Amino acid sequence: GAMSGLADKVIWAVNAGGESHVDVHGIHYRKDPLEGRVGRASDYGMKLPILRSNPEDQVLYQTERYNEDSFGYDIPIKEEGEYVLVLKFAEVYFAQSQQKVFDVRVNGHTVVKDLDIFDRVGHSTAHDEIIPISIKKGKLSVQGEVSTFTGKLSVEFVKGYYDNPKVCALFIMKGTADDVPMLQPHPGLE
Numbered sequence: 001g002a003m004s005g006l007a008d009k010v011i012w013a014v015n016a017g018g019e020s021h022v023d024v025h026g027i028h029y030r031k032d033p034l035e036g037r038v039g040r041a042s043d044y045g046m047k048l049p050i051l052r053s054n055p056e057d058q059v060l061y062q063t064e065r066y067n068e069d070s071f072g073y074d075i076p077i078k079e080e081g082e083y084v085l086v087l088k089f090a091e092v093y094f095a096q097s098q099q100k101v102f103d104v105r106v107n108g109h110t111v112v113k114d115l116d117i118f119d120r121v122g123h124s125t126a127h128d129e130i131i132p133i134s135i136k137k138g139k140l141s142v143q144g145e146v147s148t149f150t151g152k153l154s155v156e157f158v159k160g161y162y163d164n165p166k167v168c169a170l171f172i173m174k175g176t177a178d179d180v181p182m183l184q185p186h187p188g189l190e
């Protein structure tokens with residue numbers, strides 16, 4: 001009973017910062033599909049790397065473009081099973097705990113409404129949010145709230161004080177939460 005295949009189950013993945021990235025397992029981001037729709041890469045603070053990732057996956061877990069007020073993405077689906085939405089949140093020059101609090105939603109539903117990246121991980125590094133979804137017979141299930149699925153899924157984040165998401169590493173893959181592997185490079189395995 002062996003199951004290995006991350007690149008064969010991905011349906012939609014986006015990193016808000018640079019432009020198009022393929023990570024070590026085979027996960028690919030598009031190119032600026034939320035603010036402006038068609039443009040280029042913007043990096044205002046590129047000499048501050050992430051400590052819990054790789055060099056290649058550091059670019060997909062560190063690069064940020066720009067912010068405004070109340071915004072998000074659209075994911076179109078037509079199949080049922082276990083869909084997992086894992087997104088990496090990161091910061092640059094903001095030191096505060098329990099003052100810079102944000103809101104995060106999936107398909108209109110509220111899940112993490114008090115998101116502070118400095119109080120959760122500490123100073124800099126990589127922050128991770130794991131939210132498993134179950135759609136069966138044409139309806140959606142988010143933890144302890146049941147509703148119906150109609151065409152697309154939405155990721156809508158609301159403002160805290162000055163900024164909204166800051167650094168975002170969106171990754172939605174399909175079939176189950178026991179198939180998502182994440183490790184660092186090591187020479188000895190025992």
Ligand SMILES: OC[C@H]1O[C@H](O[C@H]2[C@H](O)[C@@H](O)[C@H](O)O[C@@H]2CO)[C@H](O)[C@@H](O)[C@@H]1O
Pocket residue numbers: 044065066067162163
């Ligand atoms: O100009 C690029 C960055 O602009 C803003 O960052 C501000 C920040 O909001 C403010 O508190 C501080 O005093 O100044 C920095 C820039 O000098 C945006 O928030 C960033 O997304 C931009 O990268």
